[PDB]
Amino acid sequence: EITCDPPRIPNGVYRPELSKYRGQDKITYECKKGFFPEIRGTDATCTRDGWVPVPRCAW
Amino acid sequence: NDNLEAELEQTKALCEVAKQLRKLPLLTEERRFEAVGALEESKKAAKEGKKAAKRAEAGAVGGTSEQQQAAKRAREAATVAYEASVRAEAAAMEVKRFARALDSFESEYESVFSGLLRGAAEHGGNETIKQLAKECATAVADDVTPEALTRAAHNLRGLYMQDFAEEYLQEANEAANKLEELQKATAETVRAADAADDAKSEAQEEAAQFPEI
């Protein structure tokens, strides 16, 4: 009965866009031209500790 | 779910936009080729018109009044052909300029929309959503009109609350205007190429009575 709020990814775009996500629900994200992700992958799963790994678009 | 209906509506919007962005560079290249062709034809009409004016002027030396009027007419057509070639230079320069603008736009977003679809292909909520995104991997739109570009941008912006979708709409609106101006500039090069041909022909007809060099 784990739930997540939509991820907050400044300078990036995630999919799908839903009001609420359930445990093990995966989002995929892309960064704006000029920005690159913190991790190699563009995946994030809804867990007890939020979105894992944390989605971040860096310059 | 209605969550699956949402995600399917969203995946379709990404797919529509991605297909237009892959078509834009192919479209700009056809326009760039067309402008180059139109310009070179206007330069061939001007070169030929100049030759005719020279054949008429040499021919009318010590000629009658209804022979000297011909050279004056072939000279005026040779300059009209030249002036139209100059207008085709300026119009083709605009084609290259709007094509460049549209190419920067496609470059800014194509890899983003393609990556979002790749994510939906691998991790889509349904096998329908994964199937739609997998089919859209290399798909290209049949055409791109300024109205199709903005419609798909407004559709995306209505489905995605993320700032990215709003910034895409703002940019797609600028690109729809640049695409409209790319088509006006292509028509202007073609119009001037036709204008130069008509003048070349008027110079060649008046010079028909005189000897070639």
Author numbering:
A (entry chain B): 264 to 322
B (entry chain A): 25 to 237
Original authors' sentences:
The structure of the FHR bound to FH domain 5 was determined by X-ray crystallography. The ordered part of the FHR structure observed in the crystal starts at the mature N terminus (residue 25) and ends 14 residues before the predicted mature C terminus and GPI anchor (residue 237). FHR is an elongated three-helical bundle of ~90 Å similar to other trypanosome receptors, but has evolved a binding pocket for FH domain 5 through spreading apart of the membrane-distal ends of the long second and third helices. Domain 5 has a CCP fold as expected, with its N terminus pointing away from the plasma membrane. Two copies of FHR and two of FH domain 5 were present in the asymmetric unit of the crystal with each receptor contacting both copies of domain 5. Mutant 2 FHR resolved which interaction was representative of the physiological complex and which was due to crystal packing. That is, mutant 2 contained mutations E31A and Q34A within one of the possible interfaces; these alterations disrupted the receptor-ligand interaction by pulldown and also by SPR analysis, thus confirming that the interaction is mediated by the binding site containing these residues shown in Fig. 3. The single predicted N-linked glycosylation site in FHR is located at the extreme membrane-distal tip of the molecule and in this position the oligosaccharide could potentially reduce antibody accessibility of FHR molecules embedded in the trypanosome surface coat without interfering with FH binding. The location of the FH-binding site is informative about the mode of action; by binding FH domain 5 at a site distal to the plasma membrane, FH domains 1–4 are located in the likely location of deposited C3b at the periphery on the cell surface coat. The highest affinity interaction, with a similar KD to full-length FH, was between FHR and FH domains 4-5-6 with a KD of 167 nM and the KD for binding to domain 5 alone was 562 nM.
